[model samples]
Target: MEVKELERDKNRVVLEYVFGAEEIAQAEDKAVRYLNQRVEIPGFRKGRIPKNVLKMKLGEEFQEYTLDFLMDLIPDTLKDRKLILSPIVTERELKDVTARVVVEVHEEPEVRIGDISKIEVEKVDEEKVLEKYVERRIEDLRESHALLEPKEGPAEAGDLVRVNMEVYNEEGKKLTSREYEYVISEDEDRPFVKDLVGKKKGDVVEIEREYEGKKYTYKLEVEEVYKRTLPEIGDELAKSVNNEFETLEQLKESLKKEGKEIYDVEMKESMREQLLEKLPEIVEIEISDRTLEILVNEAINRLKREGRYEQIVSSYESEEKFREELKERILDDIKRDRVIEVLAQEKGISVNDEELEKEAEELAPFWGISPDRAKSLVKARQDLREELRWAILKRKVLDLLLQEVE
Candidate 1:
């Protein structure tokens, strides 16, 4: 057989194959033998039925049998040209006498980003994030070591109080009742804490609060005010937090170190989020409608599995609106992946077949499969294989991006 590509395009291909008469004759002979054994010619036994008799008896049916055998040779003949569906024979010409197939090649979508360094983004304040984290941690330590005692007169900063609480909705309708011990610290208004301080026992206080885009009024009658005496930052405070710290300075040092480690990860994540938020503007992404449809539905199914889809659906006006929202999000996420792929191509970061096998083995338990099974399972499916490659590429690209930040 001789192969020739007649015409090709981004989406479709036309190919012609020339076959020798010997193979054509062989296909016809095999088809006749099969039909002869299967169809009974009166006195003729199954194997004893002759070819000419079957050909004469079956007529056009004999030609159909030959065509099936000729088509069997097609599967192994096409190399890298994976067609969207089974090949369609344009011209059989009797045919493996000569065959022409119309092929629809499945196209994978791609994106191109220009100059990653030009992806202008505002830097997150690492110092502020880490400093605030350590400050909160130290404040908690202070609260733990602080002494609480009943005090006279008005409440002040760092005072603890027990109070009876009545919550009312925005309409002034009573909602619930509760009792709690709360610390009145010198901080921004949180949970209606601003009104709680500077009030004594039997003082009726009202403070409005907001949560999840709704309003509530927390009416309080202060029960008892307890004065808080915080332990000075030193050996005693450090020793109380844990035996690991020998001094306040040591504790501060360790806390800063831990906070920095945590902050670096959080900032990296923050950068990724900001980068994705601006992705649609930073690059040109083109995708086929079929691929976009598949991706959006897959995303919806994921949200369904996570039990978030219903709540999300309820938030939107209709199912159509929800899908539109989901579709945009899916495209944004896909753009991030495409950007990473482009970056990986530029930087020579990739997952080869062997590397993909190794990662699949290591990451297998997360999917609850054994190591070797993961390799074989992924080897047979490229969508799963590409998922593993993306996992690796995402990690490497982030490392590169994080460096660019510095």
Candidate 2:
């Protein structure tokens, strides 16, 4: 067999193989022998059919099988040529020399660790936290326990007012309308809803609101108004939600601490994003079409989970749109991976057996499984170790980057 690499383009390599006639003949003979032993031909006992008749009946299949057999042996030919195959690759047919039992295989590009020490790590801040996000959390809790109350009295700015409303243009043409829109009590106070405050039922108010630098007149007719009633934050509420708290103040204090921790996590994520954004400048990335396709599918899967798959697909038609959406993320993902890999090497950090077991145990609840089951599952997967290694490396890098005494 003779093998020649036909073309190499951006990590895609095509190798053509031409099988010797003797090899083809040997493969054809094997096919005939197999057919003679197993195939049933009418008017001929097994292993007793005439060779010419059997060959004519199975000629095409036999020829294709010989080509495949020879193609399978092309690796040995490549080995003979001393060519190392790329780790990440997929193959497709370029040309078929079926009669001569020859074929080609394509190899994908392999990524390697580039310059590591020069990777631009962003400055991290230890005290970086999203402050007053506590109010947002409290508002979320309020919404969770909110009840409806008939708005027999006047509407207030901090009170959620539920009203049936509609908007119309100058020609009395209705543009948009909603049946039950709840205007929540936000500090900024929605000006549109605020105009309806202190207005009684059967009062049609022409509220002028500027949206995106366009002045639009919204006519809101108050059919019926209702206010949102929040559950009182007390011992009763705490016990109702979870038995872990003895009183409302206890819950609030615990939440304050937990919320601060959550803020810290957000800060870490912010720093991580900053590092990821800057990481690519330090490294050269050449992503294969195959890996990019996988990233596109991942974005599609995320869109499916977020319930916007149909809308997005309708706009960009699946794969092409998916690629456009995921290109940035995929590039970032690859860069972050390389950055973490370099950091891991620099730190000499690794997940020891005990640490791996402990980490797996800690992750069990998030996995939504028993601790033992999660441990076993992660143990069976070698990729988890690499993931843990990156996680540990990134954390340590951040610590090193951010550690400074005030």
Candidate 3:
């Protein structure tokens, strides 16, 4: 057997192979034996048929059988040459048992990352808004616990307004239409709030606003108005919100702590975004079309799994067009991931099996499953395990960068 690499291009390679007559004969014999095990003869038990008899019975089909055997052999042959290929395209020609084959295979691309140590990234500072955050948290709790009393007069501040709203462009094309129930609060600062406040039930309110050099008209028909009666912020209210809270002060403290944690997470995410934007510029990543296709499908499947598929589809002219629009974003994400992956590789970052097991156990409560069940779920899916592994490595890489930046 002789193998020749004909062409090497971005994420693809073309190869030609010539198999000798001896190899063809061996393959033919193997094919006959394989058939002898599966095919039944009238007089002989299965797997007891003579090779010659099987070959005679096969007749013209023997050539097809030999080709099928060769097809199965191709992957092992390529494996011996240290080549990993996917979505292969092949062509073959045969003359008197001597075979010539050509194959085009998707090849993995090489990634070379530049000096990342010199890549300057600054840590984002968490915002200081504890007082305002606690105030809003209290307001939200009140709203959640508020009772709506039917109002006979026009809508006023702190009234719950239910309305059917529609938005249209200057071209008179409808952009959005929906039914909305919202509090008519002066602090809300929505464009429709002022128009809605002075309107009574069964009143039609219209407001036009110019944004980005286009006029957008909002139409609202008030269906009902209700006066909002909020509970007093005290010990009783705190206990009603959560059994863990014994006093209003304790609730405020908890809200402040939770607010700080959320702020820190947002800051960390912003820092990661900054790093992602800069790292891709320094790294040379050549992604295969096959890999891109796989990621694209994964993103679409994720959207569907999250129940956003229909919402996204409605925004596009067609599903194909939506996929095309999403491909660039997904490609950017993959490129950012490649940078993280290459950096992890260069820094010798890794996640051990023990780390994975611990992480699964830690995630059990968040996943709403038992620790044993979470571990079992992770063990059942190799993809899930690898995803967790990569997630760990990515976090380690970020921690390393955080050390440098901090």
Candidate 4:
């Protein structure tokens, strides 16, 4: 058996190994080494069988395992020879019993970061409207405790009212031609219940709505009307729901604090977007054709899983065009990820799993999912953690940038 190194890139290496009769002999030797542990003979105890008999029982599969074992050992074997390889994509080209392995690795590029603190970021004027946000929270809390009553008057802006509606004339002829039965489905109509929200019973309303960049008018007839009925904000109600608070005032104050924090988060998100927009201005990403193809395939598979594959395919005149668009989206997502990773690392930004877990726990009740189910949901969407980490890092970078400019 002879091994040859072709090229070294990043953490990946290409190797051409020659395996002839000697390689077969080596495989045979390895088969004996593996069988010595698990083979059992009728008269003898487990793993006590003769080598030749064990080879006959295991057959060619055992020999294939030996080859696989060799493939697994190749990285360390090459490293021992002062060659290091880290493969992300791997493939094999086989001719008879001999094969060649092709691999791609995650290669770190040379970075030129001039003062991480000076990274340009957008600053949101959150401080100016912080008080207004707090006031809005107080108003919302008050509204939540207000008693609902039958509104004999017409529904107005800022009023929460429910109405049963049926559309008579759709602005577009095609929409009116379609069969829209009595049962209304969620997200089925344009503007999504906006036509009904602001109307009361026995009131006829004409509204213009824009959907998918096409403007259309809709005539609706309201059939019923109702207002929201909320529990009074008091010690009894507070104790019944959450025992932590004694009165409505305490709860409103807590909500005011949360509203301020939310505004701070909004500012950080704005900063992160600004930093992300600068990626193409800095790093140049080189993605292979095969990677793009795989990315498109993944997109198609995801659409199929969601039962939207055929709908998406129908929208495109050709599969090639759809795939092309999908490939671009995939490439953009990859580049954004790389940019975030580089920025996070260079700025020495980090996230504690414990902190994230605590934050998730706080949001669990709002999700309406059980605690165990929420944890499972979080793990399934672990990709969101990168966004969170990036946002936190960008906030730090933006703060430093502001300090520098000042």
For all predicted structures, in order, the TM-scores are 0.55, 0.49, 0.57, 0.48
Question: What's the true lDDT of residue 355 in model 1?
Answer: 78
1-406, model 3: which lDDT tens digit per residue?
A: 6668887666667787777788787777888778988898799886787767887987777777776676566676566332334636478766785877787765555566666676776654334467787888888888777767779888667888889899999998989998888787654556677667767788998888889989998889887888887878877667555657778888887777768877777767766667767666556767667656766887899898999899978877998988888887766665667667666878888789889998889889999989999989998989889989988887678767655642
Best by TM-score: 3
Residue-level lDDT tens digits of model 2 in 222-263: 776666777665565565466576777776666666667765
User: What is the lDDT for 40 in model 3?
Assistant: 81
Return the lDDT, model 3, position 65.
Answer: 78
Relative to the true structure, candidate 2 reaches a TM of 0.49
| lDDT of every predicted structure (CA atoms) | 0.72, 0.60, 0.75, 0.56
How many clashes show up per model? 0, 0, 0, 1
Q: List the residue pairs that clash in candidate 2.
A: none
Q: In candidate 2, which residue ranges exceed 4 Å CA deviation?
A: 34-38, 47-51, 75-270, 287-309, 315-353, 380-406
Q: For all the candidates, what are their Cα RMSDs to the real structure? A: 9.3, 11.5, 11.0, 12.2
How do the residues 42-69 of candidate 4 rate in per-residue lDDT, one tens digit apiece? 7755656676677677766565555665
Worst 10 residues of 2 by lDDT: 80-89
Error of 4 at 26 (Å): 4.2
